[PDB]
Each structure stands twice: as structure tokens, then as C-alpha cells.
Amino acid sequence: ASLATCPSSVSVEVSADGVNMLPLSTPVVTSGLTYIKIQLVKAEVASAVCLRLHRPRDASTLGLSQIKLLGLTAFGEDQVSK
């Protein structure tokens, strides 16, 4: 409804062991985006994730609706050619 409060850029840091927190890339810009998709080409073994959301371009507040964490569990063509 009011995405003027959407963060300008978000920086994701992951932790397989849950303590060593390492960045993944430069903060991806998110201003003016209705649907935030961050694809991971390589599926990452993660126990802890830190989301550093930066201040919006023309706002001092953050308005958020839902966080989804899409992944696979341990037991939940090109792969043979090599």
C-alpha cells in the first residue's frame, strides 16, 4: 500500500555454523520494487541469516509485509553429461 517505506537496498549475510556471519554481495537495490526476489544460483547450507536493510530513499521508516525462506531440507540431463 505504501512502498515509499520500502528499503533502498538490502544486504544479506549468511552463516552455516550460525556464528561466522559473512556477506554474500553488495546490497541489492530494492526501491520501487513490488516483489523482492533474490535468487541463489548455488543453494547454501544456512543456519543463520542477517538482513541489513538500508534506509529508504525518501522515507525514514520501513514498511514490510512478509518474509519467505525458500529452500530444501537434507531429504526433501546436464547433471549426468559431465
Add this chain to the structure above:
Amino acid sequence: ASLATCPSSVSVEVSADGVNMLPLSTPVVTSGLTYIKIQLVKAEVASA
């Protein structure tokens, strides 16, 4: 109310004589801006 449709960048061109249309600068990004302000340091005599 719904600024998801706000343009990403605007490129302003002026014409003192109204025919020779020429750019002023690189398009300034504007996505996620509620108030679009372009300050002109040197005031410009523009007809178009």
C-alpha cells in the same frame, strides 16, 4: 498513493529558441521518490 509506477529516471531537455532541443545531464534516478526536485544551479531561459 501508488508510486510503484514512478519512472526510474527522467532526462530533461530544454530549448531557448524552442527548436534546438538539447539534454541537460544524465537521467537522474527517481524510483522510490515521493517528491521530485531538480535544482538548477544556473537559471535557464527556456521556451520548450
